[PDB]
């Protein structure tokens, strides 16, 4: 999403690592956090 | 407690684990010692407010401890302290503080609260005789109301090294009154 | 005449001995001055009661399901155990699950009774 400033939402939105990449995964489309 | 060393060697002690403080007691002063570690633990408990001491060579395991320092520098990490003792029946320079509890008057009803320029008290009750915790709070809090020195209400050891009418604590509008 | 022994006694003391001795000895040190001995004694009683369950010297009337009479049957379950309206209905629905014991800790006679009450009301029941 914003590419820069990813910071958790649903009370369980996950900080995961893919390609030295910080993307956040949750169970709501409403989270798709991607830097 | 413990705290040691006392030759003449700053720069390095001022490096590692032993910050330097002066051995100070009316009449005599010997080269600093002690060590940032101990400091930590106890100044931690309560520099210039509680009061213990060290056992260097058993020496003169007496009290007072600090009457001057500054956790100095930039980092907010102290170095170079001032220790003083009083085996005397003269202790006058007495700085310990006093507290309240939150007497619901301005707060728990009007939101209103207080300014405590005070907190701490420097006086001189009974030497080597001061509550490690002095409590004093005739409650009362709201409107453009304020209280200080004078009124104060002091217990036993009758000193008051300070002065009347000044910086105790008052109630002020947290938003309004 | 020793600690571990006292433990042994509280332990063996059937759920009844536990509950009642708890009452008593507390009655010796009140629901305040007291705490340690009879208070844990309670959990003990829990364990013993269970024991009764696993064994057979105490039964569990479980609801297997409701049919064509959920209203009346829920009335029965409610009056029977002393479960608020809402609570009672929730459980009643649960009736089918293993813990579906509409009334646990009932003698042979009383349990047969309970089973009979639900059954009549409009539900199918089963004992232990």
């Amino acid at each position: 999403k914003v590419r820069s400033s990813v910071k958790k939402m649903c009370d369980n939105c996950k900080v995961v690592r893919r390609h030295g990449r910080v993307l956040v995964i949750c169970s709501n489309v409403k989270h798709k956090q991607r830097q | 407690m413990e705290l040691t060393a006392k030759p003449r060697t700053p720069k390095q002690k001022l490096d590692e684990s032993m910050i330097a403080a002066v051995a100070y007691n009316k009449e005599n002063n010997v080269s600093f010692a002690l060590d940032r570690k101990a400091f930590d633990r106890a100044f931690r408990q309560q520099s210039t407010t509680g009061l213990f001491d060290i056992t260097v060579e058993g020496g003169e395991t007496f009290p007072a401890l600090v009457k001057a320092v500054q956790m100095d520098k930039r980092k907010r990490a102290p170095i170079h302290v001032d220790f003083y003792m009083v085996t005397y029946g003269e202790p006058v320079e007495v700085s310990v503080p006093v507290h309240t509890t939150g007497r619901s008057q301005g707060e728990v009803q009007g939101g209103l609260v207080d300014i405590v320029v005070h907190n701490l008290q420097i006086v001189a009750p009974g030497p080597r005789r001061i509550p490690q915790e002095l409590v004093v709070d005739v409650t009362k809090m709201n409107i453009g109301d304020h209280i200080t020195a004078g009124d104060i209400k002091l217990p036993e050891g009758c000193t008051l090294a300070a002065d009347p009418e000044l910086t105790v604590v008052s109630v002020l509008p947290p938003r309004l009154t | 005449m020793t600690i571990d022994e006292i433990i042994e006694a509280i332990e063996k003391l059937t759920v009844s001995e536990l509950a009642e001795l708890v009452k008593k000895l507390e009655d010796k040190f009140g629901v305040t001055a007291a705490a340690p001995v009879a208070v844990a004694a309670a959990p003990v009683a829990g364990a013993a009661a269970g024991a009764a369950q696993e064994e057979k010297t105490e039964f569990d009337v479980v609801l297997k399901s409701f049919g064509q009479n959920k209203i009346q049957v829920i009335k029965v379950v409610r009056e029977i155990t002393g479960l608020g309206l809402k609570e009672a209905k929730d459980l009643v629905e649960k009736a089918g699950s293993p813990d579906a014991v509409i009334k646990s800790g009932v003698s042979k006679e009383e349990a047969e009774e309970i089973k009979k009450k639900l059954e009549e009301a409009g539900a199918e029941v089963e004992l232990k």
Binding site: - | V108 | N69, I71, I74, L85, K86
Partner: protein, 133 residues
């Protein structure tokens, strides 16, 4: 299988009792009038009920010592609430009368012990602006 709060002597206020229970599984006029049958013993002071309808689109069931706070109110003598509690805190009330009121509500009220009961009183009272004073 529904909970509701309602007005003694009354029973079928279109807006608050028609929608809800009616839809959840209730015959609003029936339940309402039986209701009247009931509240007729304590009319004027609001009362609460847990009404269960099971599998015929029917029933009713229980009235249980109305919300402390508001009942207290009724006792005190004041419609709505100041505006905000501990911030508009000014509805001072009394011990005795309090504790008695307790004694009466004891039912749907915590166990059946003075201490706990009256205590619940101060609590609610507070919540509203009713200050045990």
């Amino acid at each position: 299988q529904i909970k509701l709060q309602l007005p003694a002597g009354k029973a079928t206020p279109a807006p608050p009792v028609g929608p809800a229970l009616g839809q959840h599984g209730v015959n609003i006029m029936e339940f309402c009038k039986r209701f009247n049958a009931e509240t007729a013993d304590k009319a004027g002071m609001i009362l609460p009920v847990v009404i269960t309808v099971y599998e015929d689109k029917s029933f009713t069931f229980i009235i249980k010592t109305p919300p402390a706070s508001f009942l207290l109110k009724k006792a005190a003598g004041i419609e709505k609430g100041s505006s905000e509690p501990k911030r508009k805190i000014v509805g001072k009330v009394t011990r005795k009368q309090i504790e008695e009121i307790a004694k009466t509500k004891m039912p749907d009220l915590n166990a059946n012990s003075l201490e706990a009961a009256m205590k619940i009183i101060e609590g609610t009272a507070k919540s509203m602006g009713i200050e045990v004073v």
